[PDB]
Symmetry: D2
Subunit: 250 residues, 4 copies
């Protein structure tokens, strides 16, 4: 139990990466507040896990709801040690011709502006306590192109920049900020990832990402801050096209 | 004249970096369309420079005006070779406590969403021509913290990411995308600050210096340069001098 | 115990970061071979920790000793799961005028060429097993200037590049490669004034914990990563903010 | 003529990127000293270009020759404004199993240690003049894996690190340091298939133009930059899109 007594907020934690982090955060002894718009999954998950895991409906585009979410966790557990800003919507690779302004602004509002508000209100409770961790979910697209849509990539770069500015401002008060950038998080999707991944014999699951958030959130990373930690099996470090052409013709 | 016959759109080009790029773009023989909301500066500048430089009012938060701006340059000059997406608003270092959602969304709309629309409509005219370059103004803050506000930094990172996705998608059609990230662009009060702050000494960054770097990336001297966020910061972003200052102070 | 059954080689592990990783690697159940030229510390440490920790003299500039080190761990424990290439020598900030070619080549040989040989011989035993982890100790200087000597910085960049090429070549066989870049591992008051993150001093024990992460199956999909342990130091140039605040 | 009156040293400038930079440097009015071990190409090129281009035999692994090269250009033209450290040897993609220690040390000595000596002796003449530019040839491999050999990649990362430390130390005296990292400088059909940016083949002449930019006063505030000339190759891993597309 690597977070006994700690208090964690997980936005976007009723499915996906957020839901496995909630389960993991729970196995290691944290108190966790689930914040999501998926009210049915969110409440069912919070009820299955026990008393230290409660659900609160929060649209992270609405600052009133975000402020209420942080205020209520501080009313209930006395403070916020971990903010995991995981809410967002995804976009596979597309064209700049596909980009619609209304949809771009809708995505920016959930992915990027939701992270500002999560950060702004966690910092508001952590700074006077002089401790805390903020973790954002970015994406491997922040390091290599060709795996995500244009709008999604821009919003995820913005999160990295916000995370690094937070790391400076909040470092003065003992507070850490970091990002985790996964890559390729049913059956039709395994075989492609087996073809696409740089590291072989290993498929990335949501549970694996949750483990990396556990590291960054814990006191095993007590001096880690400002880091966008990639979980991509090396995918981002290689362009294999050149080697494929030398090998194909020879 | 390193761009003879080329056609350039400069959004946010009536003041600052945009205005010096317009002048430079003009000295080197480009046709340039100025796109700005500063209608008085924009039109005066376009009138002083001559026939190849015309002004068009464009709010880059409004896709209709952006679409009209690109359509009209293609109506008058036959195509668009260079899009310089330079429109944006600035914000010095601040606190996450200072961030107001309405102001964050207003800044995101001008800095980031304006760049998407500039890109989307330039690409629309360049792809069938199989040539062109898109240049964005990012900022040295995309490489080092502590020189810009939180909202501004996030929007400028988004531009880098957009620029790199564009470099992939549009490379297939011959089109280049790049960013230029300046640092350092009461006039004297701010100059003595930069003399104390800059890593490279004996040299003050001006808007004219940035315009020269955009000239490079826009020209055929960078005909194979794409996907690059080119810093113009005298090295500021590569050093944290705190450790050396403390060893020297106590010794 | 997050590595029960695993076999680890730690070069340069009789002092410093290497020695705390050895102790940590041991608490979590690994078999560890210590490889160092500090024969007195190395053997004392190996004797204090128990049967699963043994010392072997290895100069990592000598490929024959490196080859013997890997061959003997494979003779003794059946394979090598973790190679922690930690051997190296340090240089504080200096001048390009200070750089002597002989000293430069001596440093390149220990820091950089020692890492090639460590990698080359670990890969030789791991590839046919289709598993393993290689971790290098780089430095926060690979991300920001002004905290290390010129020769030292170049050798530590070379290690990052070697680590990323390895991550590609060896990923095809299931093998991971990563780096850990610490910062600031009399001296406390320096780091208390210098660090970006306040109220926390970096120790060797903290780095050992980060190597534990990268070495373990909690990073089973982490590869090609130069993981900084610097409290944010590398992400900020605070000069501009200091001048605005000083004059105002 | 963008460098009228300037004085440039080009190591490794009798062939390849170095030779086209020499020609370009010459067209734009610089005085250039060619430094190479290819004595036949070097002298023929220097004789073809005129009086402002002279050749000097210099092995950049030998500090005595490097020191003589810089001392003689300062004796002959009064100072050194541009040092283009371009000497080096190449390695295509290979295996960590292919790496031989003697070969690794030979490559480190030419690529990396040659750059230290070039830098150290240019700085020695530029610092008292309070102006100058040092440019290194790195490689696109410093940004993406899979296009160069292991030894070559490590040596080219070391150059980036050396360049960034130099940018800090020498900025205090007005001196700039930068790198240029080209990519893909039978073989053109390969590059037509491999390049991200289409309808354009990278030549040595294109790189020379980028060195011209960094060397000139059009980059008078550019320092610490590893400028890639790769048509975007380093920013994309197209594998995922290729596997989706073949199915869709």
């Amino acid at each position: 139990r690597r977070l006994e007594g700690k208090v964690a907020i997980v936005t976007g934690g009723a499915s996906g990466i957020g839901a496995s982090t909630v389960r993991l955060f729970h196995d290691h002894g944290a108190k966790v507040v689930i914040a999501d718009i998926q009210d049915d999954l969110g409440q069912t998950l919070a009820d299955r896990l026990g008393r230290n895991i409660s659900y609160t409906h929060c649209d992270v585009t609405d600052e009133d709801q975000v402020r209420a979410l942080v205020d209520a966790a501080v009313a209930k557990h006395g403070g916020v040690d971990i903010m995991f800003s995981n809410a967002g919507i995804v976009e596979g690779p597309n064209s700049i011709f596909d980009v619609d302004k209304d949809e771009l602004e809708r995505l920016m509002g959930i992915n990027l502006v939701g992270a500002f508000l999560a950060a702004k209100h966690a910092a508001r409770v952590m700074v006077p306590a002089k401790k805390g961790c903020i973790i954002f979910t970015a994406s491997a697209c922040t390091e290599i192109a060709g795996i995500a849509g244009h709008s999604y990539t821009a919003s995820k770069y913005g999160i990295v920049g916000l995370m690094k500015s937070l790391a400076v401002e909040l470092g003065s008060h003992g507070i850490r900020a970091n990002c985790v950038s996964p890559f390729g998080v049913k059956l039709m999707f395994e075989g492609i990832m087996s073809k696409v991944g740089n590291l072989k014999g290993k498929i990335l699951t949501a549970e694996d990402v949750a483990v990396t958030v556990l590291y960054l959130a814990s006191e095993e990373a007590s001096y880690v801050s400002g880091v966008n930690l990639l979980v991509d099996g090396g995918y981002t470090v290689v362009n294999p096209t050149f080697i494929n052409v030398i090998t194909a013709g020879q």
